[PDB]
C-alpha cells in the first residue's frame, strides 16, 4: 500500500544519524583543513547532539497546534539547507555552529514524526513497524563510522553533506505525498501559558510518568555501555580496537534480533505479554553481567554476553512500552512524545554521569551493579504500569 510514510520517515531518521556517525571519522581531517586544534574534534559531536536536545520541547506541541505535516516537512528542509550551508563555513567556528543548527533536525523525529506513526497505525501493526524501522536506523551507528572511514580516503569529506541532503530530498517528496496528518488540535492558539498548562497535565498522570521513566531506566544500561566501553575495554582491560568493536557485535546484534522477533510476534501475542517476554532476558542478562563481574572483577566476556542477553529483551519490549506509555495519557501526542523524550534525555544525562563515576571508584562490578538496579526500577515500574 501507500505505507511509505514509515519507509520515508526512517530514511530521514537514518539521514540525521549518519550526519554524526559518518562525520566523526573525518573530524581530524576536518579540523586540519580549518587549521584548528585537535580539541575541536569532539565538539562536532557535542554540537550535533546538543542540537537534537534543543527544540524538542516546542516542536511537539507546535505540531499539535498547526499539524504534524507542516512541522515535520519543515524540519526536513531545515536539515537539507543546513547540510548544504556547511559548505559555506569558512572557519572552524562557523563549522561548529552549523553542526549545531543541523542537530536541530533530530528533534523533529521523536516529537513529530514518530508521534504520527503511533497515531496513524493500529497497535500491533505500529509495533511491527516501529520495531523494524528501528533496525534500519541502527544501520547508521553500526556502519556509519566504518563507511565514514572509507569515504574520506577516496572522496572529499564535504561530499557527505551532499549525500545527506540527497537522501533527505528523496525523503521529503515521500513524506510530502504520504505522511498522514494526525494532529487533533489544529488551529489552536500557542502561548507559553497554555503550553505550560499542557505539560503540567501530563506530569500529573502518574501512570504515564511511570512508563516514560521505565523507558529511560531500562535503556540506560545500554547507553552506559556505549559511553564507556572504549574506556572499560581498551584503556581498562588492554584490548585492541578490533576486539573492542568486536564486543559491540553481540550486543547490538542482539538488539536487532529483539526487534525482529518482536515484529514477528506482534500478531501472535498481546503487547502486555511481549513486554513480559522481553522482561526475562532484561533481568537475566543484567544479573549475568552483575553477578559474574562481582565474582570476577575482569570478566569482560560475561559482561558482554550478559549485556547481549539484556539487549535482546529491550528489542522485544521497547516498541511495545513506547506505544503503551504514549497512549497512557489523553494529551496530544506531540506534547506526550516530547515529554517522553525529555524524561528519557534527563535519565540518560544524569544516569551516565553516575555510571562513569560508578566505574572509577569500583570496577566493572559497580558499573554492572548500577546497571542492575535500573533494571529493577524498570521491573518495579512495570508492576505499577501494567496494573
Amino acid at each position, epitope marked *: 500500500q501507500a505505507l511509505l510514510f514509515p519507509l520515508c520517515l526512517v530514511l530521514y531518521e537514518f539521514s540525521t544519524y549518519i550526519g554524526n556517525d559518518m562525520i566523526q571519522p573525518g573530524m581530524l581531517a576536518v579540523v586540519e583543513q580549518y587549521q584548528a586544534g585537535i580539541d575541536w574534534v569532539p565538539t562536532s559531536m557535542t554540537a550535533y547532539l546538543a542540537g537534537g536536545m534543543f527544540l524538542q520541547w516546542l516542536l511537539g506541541p507546535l505540531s499539535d497546534r498547526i499539524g504534524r505535516r507542516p512541522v515535520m516537512l519543515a524540519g526536513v528542509v531545515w536539515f537539507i539547507v543546513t547540510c548544504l550551508a556547511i559548505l559555506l563555513a569558512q572557519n572552524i567556528e562557523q563549522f561548529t555552529l552549523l553542526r549545531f543548527l543541523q542537530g536541530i533536525s533530530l528533534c523533529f523525529i521523536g516529537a513529530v514524526g514518530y508521534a504520527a506513526i503511533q497515531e496513524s497505525f*493500529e497497535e500491533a501493526v*505500529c509495533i511491527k513497524i516501529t520495531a523494524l524501522m528501528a533496525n534500519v536506523a541502527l544501520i547508521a551507528p553500526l556502519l556509519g563510522p566504518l563507511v565514514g572511514a572509507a569515504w574520506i580516503h577516496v572522496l572529499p569529506w564535504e561530499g557527505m553533506f551532499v549525500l545527506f541532503a540527497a537522501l533527505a530530498a528523496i525523503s521529503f517528496f515521500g513524506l510530502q505525498r*504520504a505522511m*498522514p496528518e494526525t494532529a*487533533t488540535r489544529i*488551529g489552536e492558539k500557542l502561548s507559553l501559558k497554555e503550553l505550560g498548562r499542557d505539560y503540567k497535565l501530563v506530569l500529573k498522570n502518574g501512570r504515564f510518568v511511570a512508563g516514560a521513566l521505565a523507558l529511560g531506566f531500562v535503556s540506560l544500561p545500554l547507553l552506559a555501555w556505549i559511553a564507556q566501553s572504549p574506556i572499560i575495554i581498551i584503556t581498562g582491560e588492554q584490548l585492541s580496537s578490533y576486539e573492542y568493536g568486536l564486543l559491540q557485535v553481540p550486543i547490538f546484534g542482539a538488539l536487532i534480533a529483539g526487534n525482529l522477533l518482536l515484529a514477528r510476534l506482534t500478531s501472535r501475542r498481546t503487547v502486555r505479554s511481549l513486554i513480559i517476554m522481553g522482561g526475562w532476558p532484561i533481568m537475566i542478562g543484567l544479573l549475568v553481567a552483575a553477578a559474574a563481574t562481582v565474582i570476577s572483577s575482569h570478566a569482560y566476556l560475561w559482561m558482554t554476553a550478559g549485556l547481549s542477553i539484556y539487549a535482546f529483551g529491550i528489542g522485544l519490549a521497547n516498541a511495545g512500552l513506547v506505544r503503551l506509555t504514549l497512549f497512557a495519557s489523553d494529551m496530544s501526542k506531540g506534547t506526550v512524545s516530547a515529554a517522553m523524550g525529555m524524561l528519557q534525555m534527563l535519565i540518560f544525562t544524569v544516569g551516565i554521569e553516575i555510571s562513569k563515576h560508578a566505574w572509577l571508584n569500583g570496577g566493572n562490578g559497580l558499573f554492572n551493579l548500577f546497571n542492575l538496579v535500573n533494571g529493577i526500577l524498570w521491573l518495579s515500574l512495570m508492576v505499577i504500569f501494567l496494573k
Partner: antibody
Amino acid sequence: LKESGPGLVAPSQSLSITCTVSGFSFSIYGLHWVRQPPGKGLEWLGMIWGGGRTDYNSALKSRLSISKDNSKSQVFLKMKSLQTDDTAMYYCARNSGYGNLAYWGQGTLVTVSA
Amino acid sequence: DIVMTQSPSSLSASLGERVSLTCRASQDIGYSLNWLQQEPDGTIKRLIYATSNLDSGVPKRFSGSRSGSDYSLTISSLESEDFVDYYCLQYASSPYTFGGGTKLEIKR
C-alpha cells in the same frame, strides 16, 4: 465524498455503507461516520486515521467496524445486529489540513424495518 | 463521554440582529471545538474550527468565542440564509460528541 448505502435492512441484520473519498490525499486525512436519527440530532459514530487505527463510540463499540480499501480508495462502515434505533441519515465526514470534520458527505438514508 | 448541552434550544429573531448560541461542556475541552450548520435539505457545512477560526469562505458576520466552560457563536447582522440548524462539536476526548442543536426561525 459519496456514501453508497443499502437503504433498507432488517433488525438483527448487517449493513455496509461505503464512502468513496474525493482527492488524491485519501490515506492522509482521517475519516469519520456521523448519523442523524429522524429527530434526535447528530451522533458521532467512529473514525479511522489513515493508517488504519480505529476509534469508535463506546456505546456502539460492540457492533461498529470501520475499515479502508487502499485499492478502491474508499472506507466502509459495517454495523451488526440492527434495530429501530439505527434508522438514521448516515454522513461521511473527513479531516483536513484545518482540523477535524472539515468536509462532509452527502448522506445516505438507511432504514431498519421489515 | 463529555456531554455537550447546547442552548438556546431554539431561537427566533428578525434580520440584521445580533444573536448568540452557546455550548457548555461537561468538563474541560480547552479550545477544541467546532461549529456546524445544517442547511434545510440536510447539507452539513462547517463554519468555525478550533473555537475561533472561521473556515475559508464563510461570511464575516460569524464569530466564535470562549468564556470558561461556555463557548458561543454570534451572527452580527443575520441574513435570510442564516436561519437553519446549528450544532457544536467537541473533539477533546474520544468519543467526539455533538450538541443538542439549535434551530433558527424568522421574525415574530
